[PDB]
Design a protein around this motif. Structure first.
Motif, PDB file in Angstrom:
ATOM      1  N   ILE A 197      -2.012 -12.826  21.189  1.00 52.83           N
ATOM      2  CA  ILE A 197      -1.286 -13.329  20.022  1.00 52.83           C
ATOM      3  C   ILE A 197      -1.926 -14.643  19.586  1.00 52.83           C
ATOM      4  CG2 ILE A 197       0.924 -14.055  19.082  1.00 52.83           C
ATOM      5  CD1 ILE A 197       2.130 -12.409  21.563  1.00 52.83           C
TER       6      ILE A 197
ATOM      7  N   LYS B  33      -7.038  -4.610  27.806  1.00 56.93           N
ATOM      8  CA  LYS B  33      -6.860  -6.050  27.702  1.00 56.93           C
ATOM      9  C   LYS B  33      -5.373  -6.361  27.608  1.00 56.93           C
ATOM     10  CE  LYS B  33      -9.328  -6.598  23.915  1.00 56.93           C
ATOM     11  NZ  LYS B  33      -9.917  -7.646  23.020  1.00 56.93           N
ATOM     12  N   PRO B  34      -4.965  -7.578  27.969  1.00 59.39           N
ATOM     13  CA  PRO B  34      -3.574  -7.977  27.746  1.00 59.39           C
ATOM     14  C   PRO B  34      -3.250  -8.048  26.261  1.00 59.39           C
ATOM     15  CG  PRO B  34      -4.887  -9.905  28.224  1.00 59.39           C
ATOM     16  CD  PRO B  34      -5.778  -8.699  28.479  1.00 59.39           C
ATOM     17  N   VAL B  35      -1.947  -8.072  25.979  1.00 57.29           N
ATOM     18  CA  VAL B  35      -1.459  -8.407  24.647  1.00 57.29           C
ATOM     19  C   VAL B  35      -1.905  -9.817  24.287  1.00 57.29           C
ATOM     20  CG1 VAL B  35       0.633  -8.877  23.310  1.00 57.29           C
ATOM     21  CG2 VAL B  35       0.491  -6.837  24.778  1.00 57.29           C
TER      22      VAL B  35
ATOM     23  N   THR C 102      -0.494  -1.972  29.421  1.00 58.99           N
ATOM     24  CA  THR C 102      -0.700  -3.149  30.267  1.00 58.99           C
ATOM     25  C   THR C 102       0.585  -3.935  30.544  1.00 58.99           C
ATOM     26  OG1 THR C 102      -1.260  -4.645  28.423  1.00 58.99           O
ATOM     27  CG2 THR C 102      -3.048  -3.336  29.370  1.00 58.99           C
ATOM     28  N   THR C 103       1.650  -3.743  29.764  1.00 61.14           N
ATOM     29  CA  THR C 103       2.929  -4.368  30.111  1.00 61.14           C
ATOM     30  C   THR C 103       3.932  -3.392  30.717  1.00 61.14           C
ATOM     31  OG1 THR C 103       3.937  -3.995  27.954  1.00 61.14           O
ATOM     32  CG2 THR C 103       2.643  -6.080  28.241  1.00 61.14           C
TER      33      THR C 103
ATOM     34  N   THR D 100      -5.221  -6.425  33.420  1.00 61.49           N
ATOM     35  CA  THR D 100      -4.068  -6.256  32.538  1.00 61.49           C
ATOM     36  C   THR D 100      -3.464  -7.585  32.085  1.00 61.49           C
ATOM     37  OG1 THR D 100      -2.448  -6.134  34.334  1.00 61.49           O
ATOM     38  CG2 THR D 100      -3.496  -4.055  33.615  1.00 61.49           C
TER      39      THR D 100
ATOM     40  N   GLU E  15       4.718 -12.188  25.701  1.00 61.26           N
ATOM     41  CA  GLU E  15       3.910 -11.127  25.109  1.00 61.26           C
ATOM     42  C   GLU E  15       4.622  -9.785  25.163  1.00 61.26           C
ATOM     43  OE1 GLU E  15       0.568 -13.838  26.901  1.00 61.26           O
ATOM     44  OE2 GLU E  15       2.699 -13.347  27.316  1.00 61.26           O
TER      45      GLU E  15
ATOM     46  N   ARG F 203      -1.068 -19.481  26.397  1.00 55.45           N
ATOM     47  CA  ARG F 203      -0.947 -18.977  25.026  1.00 55.45           C
ATOM     48  C   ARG F 203      -1.694 -19.871  24.037  1.00 55.45           C
ATOM     49  NH1 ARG F 203       3.712 -15.508  24.576  1.00 55.45           N
ATOM     50  NH2 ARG F 203       3.661 -15.744  22.288  1.00 55.45           N
TER      51      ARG F 203
ATOM     52  N   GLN G 164       2.868   0.147  25.312  1.00 53.24           N
ATOM     53  CA  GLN G 164       1.907  -0.869  25.735  1.00 53.24           C
ATOM     54  C   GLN G 164       1.663  -0.716  27.240  1.00 53.24           C
ATOM     55  OE1 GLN G 164       0.693  -2.897  23.246  1.00 53.24           O
ATOM     56  NE2 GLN G 164      -0.877  -3.725  24.631  1.00 53.24           N
TER      57      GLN G 164
ATOM     58  N   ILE H 214      -4.336   2.612  35.449  1.00 53.64           N
ATOM     59  CA  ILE H 214      -4.116   1.367  34.704  1.00 53.64           C
ATOM     60  C   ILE H 214      -2.621   1.081  34.672  1.00 53.64           C
ATOM     61  CG2 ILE H 214      -4.305   0.187  32.458  1.00 53.64           C
ATOM     62  CD1 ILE H 214      -6.712   2.208  31.963  1.00 53.64           C
ATOM     63  N   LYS H 215      -2.204  -0.032  35.277  1.00 51.34           N
ATOM     64  CA  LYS H 215      -0.779  -0.322  35.302  1.00 51.34           C
ATOM     65  C   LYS H 215      -0.547  -1.818  35.411  1.00 51.34           C
ATOM     66  CE  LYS H 215       1.400   1.332  38.573  1.00 51.34           C
ATOM     67  NZ  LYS H 215       2.114   2.407  39.334  1.00 51.34           N
ATOM     68  N   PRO H 216       0.589  -2.308  34.920  1.00 55.20           N
ATOM     69  CA  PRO H 216       0.881  -3.744  34.988  1.00 55.20           C
ATOM     70  C   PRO H 216       1.046  -4.212  36.426  1.00 55.20           C
ATOM     71  CG  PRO H 216       2.797  -2.482  34.221  1.00 55.20           C
ATOM     72  CD  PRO H 216       1.675  -1.530  34.293  1.00 55.20           C
TER      73      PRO H 216
ATOM     74  N   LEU I 253       7.633  -9.488  22.729  1.00 58.47           N
ATOM     75  CA  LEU I 253       7.306  -9.394  21.307  1.00 58.47           C
ATOM     76  C   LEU I 253       6.652  -8.058  20.974  1.00 58.47           C
ATOM     77  CD1 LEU I 253       5.890 -12.993  20.952  1.00 58.47           C
ATOM     78  CD2 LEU I 253       8.057 -12.195  19.919  1.00 58.47           C
ATOM     79  N   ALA I 254       5.667  -7.637  21.777  1.00 58.80           N
ATOM     80  CA  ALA I 254       5.043  -6.344  21.525  1.00 58.80           C
ATOM     81  C   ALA I 254       6.068  -5.220  21.597  1.00 58.80           C
ATOM     82  CB  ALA I 254       3.897  -6.094  22.511  1.00 58.80           C
TER      83      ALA I 254
END
Ligand SMILES: *Cc1c(COP(=O)(O)O)cnc(C)c1O
Ligand SMILES: *Cc1c(COP(=O)(O)O)cnc(C)c1O
Lengths: 449, 446
Positions: free
Chosen positions: A445, A441-443, B154-155, A157, B141, A123, B152, B437-439, B144-145
């Motif tokens: 921050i 893309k990933p989240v 990707t999560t 991801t 991440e 992070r 979302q 597309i998957k986590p 929080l998202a």
């Protein structure tokens, strides 16, 4: 439960309410420990064992070191545990101690676990650089992105590329897309690689202005008193935890100021990061390890054990490789079943060897504890040879190059061959990163737009 | 010897994140606490209403907790080669007996890891991809998202913002892809029945209902929201569990907790024994007759006194929620912070987020000291900052209440066009997604 407990009685009782069958029982040796002292464990029936597990490495001094116990107790009893201020006097004192002790440490922040500490490292690198990708190898914890990153390749991801301890791969990835790389995060492995290998990796990363971050959650106090970094490997971030507070939960993320300064915008937090008693325990650990002769004597005890194990195996004609740092050395054998059988059998002879093959003495070890463990290893090796000749070759020789290359991939995802499939995997992965759809893309921050 | 500003400057060069460690904490650096009181490094004393962000339930240096943790550390040890220990076994047994939802219980160090374990277990046990979430679950991440309404990909997490209607339409459209619902109970805007209805809705979709009670577990009641009659397949607790020492617990249904092995969850400090001893002392205190009831009476004394002060000064206000975690809502977001900051000048640490947290060590004197400081601070802010301190009485407007729910916990409580479009937009994005597309899912879902 103040007396007359049995191992089997409490194991059964744990199965009903809490025990994960494989993680808590099948993998653990099936006695249940009631106390520890120095190098020794006592189970609930009074059986004593020499401990080479260090409780998966979190203990560096031995069980119930009195300096650590006093410092924890004074804080808890006479001051408190967690305050409205996240800053505390022991936190400031420990951070000052750590910054004076490590050239990479310009600022230090704290958490509870290694998994959270290495997550903090990624992070911070992302928020500091404004870049997306982490290049990783080695175990970093149990979160998905950490686990997936042990395997060579690209997880779009999570934004993590695994590079499998492969020097060539890393250079070609940095050359191809290093401007997208927020950091390298590597858990040093010291059986197959020397200090110079990591020195060259730092130098490579610095030439691309990519933060070089070592996960030394494991190696921090066992590759040397100041970890791998202290053997002369520069670093932009170092994470430590195991040994830091001698088994109490504490992790430290130490690094150069501009990276640690990204804490606020990174979104890292955690209500227990402020917890004060563990920071007093960590300063006791540092005082013990910095006492002249202590760390040297421990390394002598680790050499005594490792050399004895080498002799016992070589004398029986078992091909073997015993290497690595004295306080975290590995034993590699022709097959994966032989070591586990010996380590299991040795439990019957009063010693808790670490199953995975890395033995971990602590500073409390004396020669009687080492020699008790060698006696058990000697008896256990002889019995396994007698009972299981199908996995116990006794005709001498060295490990084959095949076995050593295969074991590195199996044990830590190291891809150390210069054959066509490894080079094909390198080129495939780089192609997948470079030609990717960047809208996936990933989240991040903060957001990177 | 030692000064607040001296140690803060030292702290700045070696460890302090300016905003998180300093800008948001009222100047003084604490050196000790005892019961309801804190002492900073220059000797100033304060009534503590922060409970160290809620981790403390009994007060500072409760004797039974200190005795329990000290015996374990000094007479037995801290972490052993066995991940099982006698105090772990006893605490798991005690928790399973104490909670209807608790058939098995596993442990970790933090709430953020606790709630991550809840999602990993629900996915591993059901074999399904999606988590529907609202409310804070930690700093990772995906947590929080997830506080924001929307999907979302990707999560694998969809935020539904405490919106009952959204949740029901989501389960009808793609509930067979939902491994679990994970909600942090909010008890100012919603009642117990709201969470009972949510349990039942997930149940008839065969979707595990999981309550993140890291905050509420011992402050909604001695057994949390679950204890007030809300069934659950999983409950996570942590704040209060070991009275400030780091421990979290994930309690639930056998078939979900039994997925631990294949889920890949671990953690070398999950076996740490002293915090488990501390937790059993905490449950011992909490279950002593008179103790919890007296703490709620003190919370009501504080809340009622705060409501009286604000109403009597003409400040529109809303004071509500459970006694051990009540909120004070004001017409704007600057007034509260200014009052709480000023109250620090009068010897009390209010929680500046607006949720005050008494502990079981509070007595009337401690409550009334906080109230004296609150009165003086409110009246000072009114005289000094009339631009943010309206004194014309009345109630909070509906607009202010609706906006606050969105700002403070992502609650989308409006039945307007823009909310309903968001609901439909989010469902369409889930249903019509590129399912390649998957986590990362452990074990892999094939
Ligand atoms: C143990 C370990 C971790 C994980 O730390 P935990 O506290 O168990 O979450 C991360 N990296 C390395 C190298 C480790 O040995
Ligand atoms: C505090 C909190 C968390 C995070 O717990 P940490 O120990 O700070 O990581 C998760 N969920 C809720 C409801 C919380 O209040």
């Amino acid at each position: 439960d103040s007396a007359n407990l049995t191992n089997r009685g409490l194991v059964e009782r744990a199965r009903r309410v809490t025990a994960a069958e494989n993680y808590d029982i099948g993998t653990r040796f099936s006695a249940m420990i009631q106390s520890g002292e120095g190098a020794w464990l006592t189970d609930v029936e009074g059986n004593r064992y020499v401990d080479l597990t260090a409780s998966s490495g979190t203990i560096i001094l031995g069980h119930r070191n009195q300096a650590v116990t006093e410092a924890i107790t004074r804080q808890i009893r006479d001051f408190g545990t967690a305050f409205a201020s996240t800053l505390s006097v022991p936190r400031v004192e420990l951070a000052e101690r750590l910054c004076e002790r490590y050239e990479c440490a310009e600022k230090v922040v704290f958490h509870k676990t290694g998994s959270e500490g290495t997550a903090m490292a990624a992070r911070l690198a992302r928020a500091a650089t404004g870049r997306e990708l982490i290049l990783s190898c080695g175990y970093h914890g149990w979160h998905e992105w950490q686990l997936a990153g042990e395997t060579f390749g690209y997880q779009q991801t999570t934004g993590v590329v695994g590079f499998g301890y492969n020097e060539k791969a890393l250079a070609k990835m940095l050359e191809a897309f290093g401007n997208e790389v927020a950091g390298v995060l590597i858990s040093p492995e010291l059986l197959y690689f020397d200090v110079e290998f990591y020195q060259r990796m730092y130098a490579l990363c610095a030439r691309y202005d990519v933060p070089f971050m070592m996960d030394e959650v494991y190696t921090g106090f066992r590759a040397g008193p100041k970890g791998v970094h202290g053997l002369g490997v520069p670093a932009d971030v170092v994470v430590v935890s195991k040994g830091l507070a001698n088994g109490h939960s504490l992790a430290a993320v130490m690094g150069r100021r501009d990276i640690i300064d990204a804490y606020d915008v990174s979104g890292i937090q955690g209500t227990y990061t402020r917890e004060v008693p563990p920071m007093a325990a960590a300063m006791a650990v540092l005082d013990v390890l910095d006492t002249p002769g202590v760390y040297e004597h421990a390394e002598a005890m680790g050499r005594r054990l490792a050399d004895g194990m080498r002799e016992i195996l070589t004398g029986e004609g078992i091909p073997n490789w015993v290497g690595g740092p004295a306080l975290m050395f590995d034993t590699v054998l022709p097959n994966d079943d032989l070591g586990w059988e010996i380590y299991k059998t040795a439990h019957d002879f009063g010693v808790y060897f670490e199953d995975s093959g890395t033995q971990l003495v602590t500073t409390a070890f004396d020669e009687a504890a080492v020699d008790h463990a060698l006696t058990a290893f000697r008896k256990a090796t002889r019995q396994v040879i007698a009972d299981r000749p199908d996995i116990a070759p006794t005709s001498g020789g060295e490990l084959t190059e095949e076995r050593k290359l295969d074991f590195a991939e199996e044990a830590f995802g190291g891809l150390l061959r210069d054959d066509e499939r490894t080079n094909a995997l390198i080129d495939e992965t780089i192609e997948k990163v470079v030609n990717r759809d960047r809208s996936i893309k990933p989240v991040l921050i903060p957001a990177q737009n």
